[PDB]
Symmetry: C6
């Protein structure tokens, strides 16, 4: 019950997060590297420490996740276009399209779960403003400073909450589908 409104809410949340990231994410991380001050005098002790502290920026991971999530929708649209171009057998084709969509949404749920787990394990919750690094160029351990940690961690928490809401909606959709539909999709 209430499946269509749930799908509508999920689409609204997807559009909301896509617009929010495409508007704000570029500006926050536009000059992250430039605003890096570290207590050191050895040349090259700054770039190595910045790479160690932030190997992959959060914006790249978010963009990658958003682009990867939309691929089943794109392939479904292409398959529907091909089916329309091609045209008792119609009912069989409709059933095949339905089971294809079911498998697509299951794969989308799996991808969302994997992306959420990876984001949780990689970045975490809070962004440390102060970092301690010791690589080959730096003779001893040095203390570097990060710029704007509060905004980064707040936006990361918001992204995690949005991903959790999407996961909950996807689980609700899977529960609406149910064991019989899962078994039918398997066979």
């Amino acid at each position: 019950h209430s499946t269509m409104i749930g799908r509508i809410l999920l689409t609204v949340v997807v559009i909301f997060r896509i617009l929010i990231v495409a508007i704000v994410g570029e500006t926050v991380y536009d000059d992250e590297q430039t605003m890096f001050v570290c207590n050191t005098l050895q040349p090259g002790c700054n770039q190595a420490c910045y790479d160690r502290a932030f190997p992959i920026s959060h914006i790249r991971y978010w963009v990658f996740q958003i682009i990867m999530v939309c691929t089943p929708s794109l392939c479904f649209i292409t398959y529907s276009v091909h089916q329309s171009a091609k045209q008792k057998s119609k009912l069989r084709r409709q059933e095949g399209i339905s089971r294809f969509y079911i498998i697509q949404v299951v794969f989308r749920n799996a991808l969302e779960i994997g992306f959420l787990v990876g984001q949780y394990f990689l970045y975490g919750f809070s962004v440390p403003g102060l970092y301690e690094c010791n690589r080959y160029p730096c003779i001893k351990e040095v203390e570097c400073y990060v710029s704007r940690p509060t905004e980064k961690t707040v936006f990361l928490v918001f992204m995690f909450a949005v991903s959790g809401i999407c996961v909950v909606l996807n689980l609700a959709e899977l529960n609406h589908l149910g064991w019989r539909k899962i078994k039918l999709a398997v066979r």
Copy 2:
């Protein structure tokens, strides 16, 4: 009475504020971090003080509020599209759409009130040109300077006035709806 003209005025104000922010807000806060001068010599005493003075910039909050306000309209549009795709029962569907729109506008009023309260409590009215900060990197209290405070506080006051006008229009719409419509929406 005069409900349609009030809704037209509200839409005009929304378009006005959206265009104004999308035109001017990026340029004002484009290089806020760069134009930061503080009386200190300790490395890292500038970024921490800037983060303390401005944890979240006003432009991010305004963009977030604008994007959040438009979500009920987007979900209503999607629901209308779904209803059109699906098509005595028509009258019942129209009544359901009407009560859905009523609940949507009530939620929009609540969200606007919450956003206005948060903006008032977080930023306030005036932006202090001079700041005094004392964090761990800075040994003692230091005096930092902010660039272009007058423009920031003027634009913040204008945004507050626009939000107040929108709140007044929303309250007028709720009064036009009235207790009977609220009770019907509840049940």
Copy 3:
């Protein structure tokens, strides 16, 4: 007489000024703050003096005026769309639309007059290349220098001339309307 050609000329002037500002204004004021040199050594004596000399930049005022001027046109378009969606009474509706447009153009003339008066009182005619400032951060009076004053004052004079031409055209339209139409709009 010659009312339609006057309105056409006014629209042409509006499009001309909008295109001119949207093309040139961003580049002139793109790096105004960076090109600021002042004879001082006290930290923070530059930002405060720049804020004192230029509290609100001319481009922001021009953009605000242009956006505010177009609001009656937008509300008229929305009202016309609503009237078209809704559809002896037709003649009454047409008369109401005509008087609404008359009131709208009167309000537009008033807004243009107010904006012109504010621009004249705030900025003036010439931009002083050399400024003398004495605020709290600066111990004594200091002499700061402004970059590209000639272009700024020339473009300000051109904007003032365009606003004057628009005001003259609006006054001509009001004279064409006349006392009888004003009295009819009042009642």
Copy 4:
């Protein structure tokens, strides 16, 4: 004779110059102020000398000329739209449109001549790489250096040649019109 092909060539040249300027002009003058080196030590001796050497940049004048030239075409299009909306009298209206277009093209030729004369008198042909300036901030005469003079003067010469070609085409069109058409337009 060969009037239509001449008008086609004029339109092609206008599109060519518009595309060329809109593509290249922004990049050449993007950082003209930054690449300014002058043999001086007095603060403020650089901005004043740059303003004296280049009061108005060539790109602003070219953009202003291009925008001003297109205004008669825009007003003619608006008048044609109004005439279409409004609809022996048709022949009179067509004759009025023809004489209006004749007056418009005469005004366009006059504006082009004035703009060409102003460009010739203001900028000239060659851009001096070395400048000598002596204003109030600079105690004595100082020698400043300009960046990329050859490209600026080459593009200025090309713009002058394009303007001359346009003037020649406009004069050919005026000769095709002739004394009888000029007299008819006058009365």
Copy 5:
């Protein structure tokens, strides 16, 4: 078997990689040259070492490969447009179009193989964070440092994996075509 779904998946992968690169590649390599620190004091020892370490950036090669891959599709579209404009002979024309498409896809597979081999031989897998260079401007061997190596090598590995998947799909399509179709295309 499963040829159409394979082509759909290949198109989806192409769109995915195109969007991913067009979104992320510009920002990563936006300021690669600026963030270059090398242990040297001789002027010109930095630019030569940067050129030696990175003669051609990865983004240029990826853009070139993507643009080159799409050329057979563009020429096929143009040929189809010409055939549509031009219109037992229809069957012969369809067979000619089919064999033209077969030759086009064979050429596309060859181009993809060549581009993959070139990318593997030129860049490799890992980006060395530390480089040792000795050119004419630098008296002796000097040690330069690269900024953000981990992101560059991760994205390069992802691009290599995407190219491998595309190559596998193209080989599957060629196997579906088969020896008989290859022989028919040859003659």
Copy 6:
């Protein structure tokens, strides 16, 4: 024979080169002036040497050539639009259009040959990474260094190869036309 496929290939090559330049050329030459290091201490010895080494950048010449090449196509399109608006005489008009197109393609071949000769004579093949300059501001001969020479010369070689391919295709088209068509176009 094979004229239509040759024209299709020429159009494909034109689109390919236009897309390639519009994508990559801006980024390569975005900050050429900034990354200029020369062994000198006299102020103004850098800008003059940079102007001497690179009077006109390659990107400007390429953009100018591309824009100039497309002008006959634009004028042909405008002439076709005029002919369509205007409408035994039809056959004569078609023959006139054909001979006009022949003259247009001959002029395009001549322009391409001239542009190729100019590019070969001006820039050459290789970009010298090291330059020796001696102008008035510099007391003696000084050694300046160029940034990213390998990419510039590689892209220049690619542009030369593309221009050569276009010239070969144009010569093939002219050979297909032949002496009889040339004589008919002359008279």
